[PDB]
Design a protein around this nucleic acid. Sequence first.
DNA 1: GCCG
DNA 2: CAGTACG
DNA 3: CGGCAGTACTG
Length: 317
Amino acid sequence: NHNLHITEKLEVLAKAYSVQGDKWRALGYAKAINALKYQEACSIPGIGKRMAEKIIEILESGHLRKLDHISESVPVLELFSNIWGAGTKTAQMWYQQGFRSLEDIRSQASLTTQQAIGLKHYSDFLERMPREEATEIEQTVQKAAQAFNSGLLCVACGSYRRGKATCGDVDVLITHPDGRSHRGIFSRLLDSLRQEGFLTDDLVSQEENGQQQKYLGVCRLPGPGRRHRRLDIIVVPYSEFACALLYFTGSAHFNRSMRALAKTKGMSLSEHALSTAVVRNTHGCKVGPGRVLPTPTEKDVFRLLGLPYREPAERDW
DNA sequence: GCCG
DNA sequence: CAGTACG
DNA sequence: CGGCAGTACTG
Ligand SMILES: [Mg+2]
Ligand code: NA
């Protein structure tokens, strides 16, 4: 990156729009900020005239005036928004109600079960773990899984799979290549991890149902010097394994770019599958289902979209 | 915010 | 349902 | 003008 004086100033702006709920403008900035990672400004995709102008103001002037006049509410909104389970609406509401610190939130705010947990682990959830710790967390989930049923497939996705040194959490994808081998596997896996005292909190866990798709919660390895880590587990049918793998590996931007591409071909891509001949209206909204395509591997999904394959490492963007 |  | 979250 | 990804929970 040859433009950090510029990007870091836009970045602040990106986050400010994001936390204030102007999500499409934030999206716009995020693209431009990755491009950078006047005539020449426009030349790059993701960078329009209005973005170009802001770069020239930084290049020429050295300050950025929209930066100067960012609402002073924004740092507090970002403080609040980093509570897991709280987003831009809740953060604004709290602000409106006069709250300005986590101490206020603690003593005065009404909190959902999820938000109380997020607050309890506020610092921990802002940290990233060394990818080696992610390895141990995966192995812990895997061995519990495989004990119940061997041959089961367990794999760490997200930033871990993309080869990052550090991970914000652990994403464990579980599947069985032997058809429909899992009935109430969540019941047993989670009970298993609870008995070990490995899980510390649950954020999202609809266990009253049966067809629980995901578990999102909190875990902590045994011994001194350990922090609470976020853990997401999903169990999928084997036929959906490549698409689940692709989804859960990300990046989020990579996924959305790829999904947006499929939409351009009358196709559709989700955690579940890649479909063809999807019927959508003038607003881009699905009005008729297409038809699931065979995708035994990730390479198939790429191939069926007419794309060259990309290793997980090359999917940060 | 960008872009078709 | 709105809000938040997952990648 | 208007889409910007497509999903899964909570309450
Ligand atoms: Mg939050
Ligand atoms: Na992750």
